[PDB]
Amino acid sequence: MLPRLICINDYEQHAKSVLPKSIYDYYRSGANDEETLADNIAAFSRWKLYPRMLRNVAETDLSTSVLGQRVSMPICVGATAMQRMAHVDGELATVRACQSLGTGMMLSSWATSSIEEVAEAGPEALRWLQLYIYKDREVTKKLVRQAEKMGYKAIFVTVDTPYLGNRLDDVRNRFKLPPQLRMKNFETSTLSFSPEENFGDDSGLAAYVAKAIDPSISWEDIKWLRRLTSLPIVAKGILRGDDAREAVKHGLNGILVSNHGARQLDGVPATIDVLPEIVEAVEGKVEVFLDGGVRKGTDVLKALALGAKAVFVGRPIVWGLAFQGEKGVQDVLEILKEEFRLAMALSGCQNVKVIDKTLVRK
Amino acid sequence: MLPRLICINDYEQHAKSVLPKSIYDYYRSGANDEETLADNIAAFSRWKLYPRMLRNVAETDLSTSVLGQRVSMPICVGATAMQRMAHVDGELATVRACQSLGTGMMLSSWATSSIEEVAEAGPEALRWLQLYIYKDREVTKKLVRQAEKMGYKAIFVTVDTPYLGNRLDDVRNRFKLPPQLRMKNFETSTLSFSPEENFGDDSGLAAYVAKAIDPSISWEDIKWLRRLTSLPIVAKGILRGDDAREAVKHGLNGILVSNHGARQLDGVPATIDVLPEIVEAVEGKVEVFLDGGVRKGTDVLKALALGAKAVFVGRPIVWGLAFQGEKGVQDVLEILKEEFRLAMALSGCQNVKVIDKTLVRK
Amino acid sequence: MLPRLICINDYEQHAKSVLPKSIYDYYRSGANDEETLADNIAAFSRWKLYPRMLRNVAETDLSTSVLGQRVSMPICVGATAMQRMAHVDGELATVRACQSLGTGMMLSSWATSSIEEVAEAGPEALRWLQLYIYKDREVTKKLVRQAEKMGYKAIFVTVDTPYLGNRLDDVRNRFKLPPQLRMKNFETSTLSFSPEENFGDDSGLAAYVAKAIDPSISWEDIKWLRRLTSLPIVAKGILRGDDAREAVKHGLNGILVSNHGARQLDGVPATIDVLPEIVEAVEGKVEVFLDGGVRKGTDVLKALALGAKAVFVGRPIVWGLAFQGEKGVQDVLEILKEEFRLAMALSGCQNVKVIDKTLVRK
Amino acid sequence: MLPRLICINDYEQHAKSVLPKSIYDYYRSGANDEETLADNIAAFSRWKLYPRMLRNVAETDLSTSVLGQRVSMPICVGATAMQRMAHVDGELATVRACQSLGTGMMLSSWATSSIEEVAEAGPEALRWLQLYIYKDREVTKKLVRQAEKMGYKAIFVTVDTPYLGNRLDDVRNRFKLPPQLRMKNFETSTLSFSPEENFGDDSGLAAYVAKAIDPSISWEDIKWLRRLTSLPIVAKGILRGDDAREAVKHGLNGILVSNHGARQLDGVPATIDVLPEIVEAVEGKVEVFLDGGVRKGTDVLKALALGAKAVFVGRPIVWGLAFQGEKGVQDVLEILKEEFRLAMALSGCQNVKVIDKTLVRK
Ligand SMILES: Cc1cc2nc3c(=O)[nH]c(=O)nc-3n(C[C@H](O)[C@H](O)[C@H](O)COP(=O)(O)O)c2cc1C
Numbered sequence A, B, C, D: 001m002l003p004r005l006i007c008i009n010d011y012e013q014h015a016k017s018v019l020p021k022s023i024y025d026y027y028r029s030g031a032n033d034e035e036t037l038a039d040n041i042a043a044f045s046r047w048k049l050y051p052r053m054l055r056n057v058a059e060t061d062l063s064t065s066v067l068g069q070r071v072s073m074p075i076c077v078g079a080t081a082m083q084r085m086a087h088v089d090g091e092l093a094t095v096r097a098c099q100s101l102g103t104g105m106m107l108s109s110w111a112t113s114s115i116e117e118v119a120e121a122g123p124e125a126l127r128w129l130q131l132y133i134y135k136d137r138e139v140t141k142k143l144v145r146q147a148e149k150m151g152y153k154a155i156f157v158t159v160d161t162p163y164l165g166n167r168l169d170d171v172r173n174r175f176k177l178p179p180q181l182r183m184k185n186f187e188t189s190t191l192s193f194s195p196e197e198n199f200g201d202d203s204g205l206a207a208y209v210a211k212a213i214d215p216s217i218s219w220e221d222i223k224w225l226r227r228l229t230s231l232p233i234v235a236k237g238i239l240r241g242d243d244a245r246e247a248v249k250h251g252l253n254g255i256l257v258s259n260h261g262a263r264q265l266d267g268v269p270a271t272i273d274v275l276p277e278i279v280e281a282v283e284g285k286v287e288v289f290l291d292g293g294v295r296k297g298t299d300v301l302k303a304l305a306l307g308a309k310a311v312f313v314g315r316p317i318v319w320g321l322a323f324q325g326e327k328g329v330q331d332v333l334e335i336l337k338e339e340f341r342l343a344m345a346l347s348g349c350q351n352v353k354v355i356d357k358t359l360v361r362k
């Protein structure tokens, strides 16, 4: 009769009921037959928890740090493009909620709000820029320079998207932005993903990527980026230990173990399953983060037990927006925070420093 | 047309048909997505039986002992709170059925009948008290002293509930006691869980626990309890071998391998799967019991084969109450007894002493 | 519109459509939650075939022998009680079909036709008696002596039924014989399972067994039987290697690896899964047979690859009867024969002697 | 409203909607309970991809070679009988599409178009003949000689069909050719599979095979074929390493790891699962190919990672025909090509030579 939403799945169900089909499908979809999409969630269930009893959990402290900046909890907002499709306030709502929670927001290069607009809305929020390497390196450099100028604290360079994955619903729906919206970090019709522009007869976004994003990028482009900015840089989308070691060798400052929300290559493993290999490979030299399939407090606990410093959430944030903008994002983050606090307490962990590998077994 | 209930699942189906939704949901629920709830049952199915033929099973003897007290069968009633929601006679019905069967009843601290009332109803019944450590240690001590005075033979201290688990239906339903009922071991409105008292806008019971139950408890509180009473004490809710060894070191007299009916931390293993680790860890120094998912005679057989002295049943007892009070509990216990007798006979076991590890393989 | 039944599953579907519910349920059921019933079939699917190509399979020879008697195929009829419930001609139809096919029939002690009647109907058929050890050993001896006199060639002594398993539908349905039928090997109202006799308020057959069948039997009773008859004796219902070795030590002549069609102890392994252990344990000293879940030619092939001499089929035969008596049983046996011939041919096997362990992998 | 078919599964769904039931069922079916049919697809999903990032995939080159002949992609058309049932133009449509794509077509001996007709329609297409060994070796020789004369570049001799598998729908439907069609490589009523000819009361095709195809063939017949033609010969239908080694010893030039689209012996492994054993067994001495269950670009990638030179597709081609003849086949091949290109790019592979075993893990 009146929404009573008490877990992240409830927010998704609500979002499906209120969003236009093409928009819900864009946000929900994975690549191809969505094998990895299912596995990102199923894999968490296979990792079992071995809680310690009688540890004194009256005072739980969820605080930690990400690349040297304190956060209230090891749960941060990951980059999700074009948030104004979910709610009129989009990324401005999201950053305000992050400011309230004391956690960080990773801003998409494909945001429907500019780097500057987001900084103005959340001046005291911890903010990072997710970067795509455009064919036009002057565009790419401008994004980085604006992030520096506007008080962003890291670059998350996405390394798994030389081309866009094939999301079948987006092809069926001929996905494009609603008429009033643009990718607001760009000036030209092409780069702003104008829905009045020719992006072919399939997914508009796949065509956008083919036109705008450089499929040639290599470790040499990582060298270029490392020279361009002194900001911390995290490689986002690494799934192999050898690639993780290469990122460390290139002077990067973190790895975000990610399969892009299962939206790129289908049939890759779940992120929680590859996380241990990556943690082992980097030998403590950089922080390792995870995204993909985080929906519950126990997911966060499992990721930290396997050596992630923090996790990022994608889709849950857009479901929060779809419910009630800033307040909805606040709600989703508070649910995750409280579920994580309870999971910590019930497993005997007073703080994030005592979350150890003995807590989990596959 | 007329109930013909011949197995425990039939009693649950009947209970669902007659109980108010909020009450059925409270009794049925597990925590969060109920992964462990499903696994407590599924795990029993993965343990396969290797029966011996031609052993002479004309005389089966199901009798055993629990902490030195003889019982008619290795199947005992576990603590389930607030039984008068299922049937007007609640815990008084349950204890009378246990008296008839010759098995033991573990009484919840959160019973809708007092320690004294239950003793008066079942004077010759084997009875134990399940204890929660209240913030108020005077309350806690009074519970123990009353159990001693009223002829209870052990304390089962619950160690997995510093806070209540998150049972989604109880949040949705805003679970609370029916207006005529109270937790009858307590005098004050707060501690008696009065449904006229302010227990917030979510699960009333979760708020009750946050107000009443001490999240700080540690092994030091176990030391306090061990000094307080000379009764046998069993640690209820242990899932790790290291914790089991610590319980032995603290002078406790048993371990009840339990995930709290899958109602606390979701994603812990099934109790039948962790039982072998715990049996190995305690090296025969104390009795080890199991609860969680026992529905059939073969479940009992599997638990004993893996080294449990006895098992406890939770939900089946409340379904018995929902059917027909004392008679219904009697029925459920008799079904379990007869199923266990048949399973013993068909596997070549004349008595519980010959139920060996070679009977099972995972 | 008109039955077109081309595989064993089709015969079952037809049987369900024409038989009274209580009769279909009696024949179909397994014990308790029917975990083993499902597994008897599922386990065959997990054993994969590794066919050899280009072996010359123009001439396939399915013939073999069972306990020294030639059969046309390694597929024989297992004991299924009370066949006249499925078709007026019951066991007489079955034995005539076996005579036509050139395979053997194992006659139930609980047949609705006498040992003599079956011999008269199928004088040239290979016939064996399945024996239950009655409390009354004079009854038991009479069965054996009649089998000897009437040209039966072996005794299959059932060793897994000290009591009947708990088949839930039979309890719900209060299973008993139709009014015109009896267990025709017995004279008295009790032993003939008269439906006019008091067999309690649950399954009539469970009560019959409790009254008639001896739960005390042991290896000493096997010694008695071995002394009583010089006929070959097969132990039916062995699931453990140690028991198989004991059967060999007692001078028995075969083992039928059987979980009684999953009708006795639920949660035992599938017969195809325990067959290798039993074959290994007996070291070629006696023939090993399998029943349980055989529905297709590839099931037969898998069993022989893992070292069974022959398989027995239970339920498929009664579905044949339900369709069209003798002709229906003939049809089912011919389908199994042809499926087995094709499976042999496609796997490169010209005869049963070349069916080797390399053909299968789990 | 109007077909929008964007993946191979969409083409199948369309085909089911437009084809007569008997024709769709013939094309779709596997043998018996279709366990292998399901597994051919499911097995691909169990092999997980481990993509390399930042490799420079701006220029992807899909080209390779098959038995010394260049192809545009490692995706070729496998033999599927009687294609004119799907579309009036049948095999002529298929060969024209292959010519356009720059890939090869394997022509069925049971084609509804002659060897010569197909050569005339696709003179510049890479074409191979799939050969069945007929009882009549003069027929068999004529097929080979015509393939030689008409510019076919290899013989794929099918070695897994001494008899036809039992496809239940074909039995139910009494499958036969539509009245206007014939197997056009043959002159006589029997060998042309005339639907006016007596092929029994079950599957017409099973009876055709029993009459026409030689179940006696052995390695001696492979010796005969190797002497008959200097064309490259591939053994099609090998599932064992020992058989693969024998094919190499007989001077054959390739192995097509195939379970005949799961249409012959049911319960054999998926082809992707046996491929590694076969690749290892032949020690690089001949090319190894795969068919069975290829539906997506990632399937192609997985097969090449495990050492296949190329894959063949069966059913997808007939669904293309059912949609729109030549254009439909073109569409299906272009979808597979583009999916494969994207999978290569997202996994860091610029060309087929760098697709390595480290890309996959089961
Ligand atoms: C709707 C949507 C949009 C996304 N947009 C971007 C993006 O612009 N840049 C990027 O690097 N990753 C993007 N991602 C990937 C996310 O940063 C993140 O890896 C993913 O959402 C994590 O999985 P989850 O949705 O299961 O939490 C997107 C994911 C989704 C679901």
Ligand SMILES: Cc1cc2nc3c(=O)[nH]c(=O)nc-3n(C[C@H](O)[C@H](O)[C@H](O)COP(=O)(O)O)c2cc1C
Residues within 6 Å of the ligand: B026, B027, B028, B040, B078, B079, B080, B081, B108, B109, B110, B130, B158, B236, B258, B259, B260, B261, B262, B263, B291, B292, B293, B294, B312, B313, B314, B315, B316
């Ligand atoms: C409705 C319900 C109420 C319970 N109340 C208590 C309680 O008051 N104290 C306690 O220590 N455990 C309690 N438990 C946990 C049980 O003692 C026991 O661990 C659990 O019921 C065993 O699993 P089963 O229900 O599958 O048999 C409760 C469980 C249920 C289902």
Ligand SMILES: Cc1cc2nc3c(=O)[nH]c(=O)nc-3n(C[C@H](O)[C@H](O)[C@H](O)COP(=O)(O)O)c2cc1C
Residues within 6 Å of the ligand: C026, C027, C028, C040, C078, C079, C080, C081, C108, C109, C110, C130, C158, C236, C258, C259, C260, C261, C262, C263, C291, C292, C293, C294, C312, C313, C314, C315, C316
């Ligand atoms: C309806 C039915 C009746 C049976 N009756 C007997 C019996 O009288 N004696 C016996 O030893 N086994 C009996 N069995 C067990 C069978 O001999 C055999 O072990 C079983 O049917 C094999 O499994 P299947 O039905 O999957 O082929 C019976 C099984 C069924 C299904």
Ligand SMILES: Cc1cc2nc3c(=O)[nH]c(=O)nc-3n(C[C@H](O)[C@H](O)[C@H](O)COP(=O)(O)O)c2cc1C
Residues within 6 Å of the ligand: D026, D027, D028, D040, D078, D079, D080, D081, D108, D109, D110, D130, D158, D236, D258, D259, D260, D261, D262, D263, D291, D292, D293, D294, D312, D313, D314, D315, D316
């Ligand atoms: C409808 C159909 C007809 C076929 N006809 C032949 C044939 O005539 N000769 C042959 O060697 N294989 C034949 N096959 C097997 C295919 O060559 C190939 O092994 C199989 O289709 C591959 O699996 P897929 O359909 O999953 O791609 C046929 C398969 C199908 C589905």
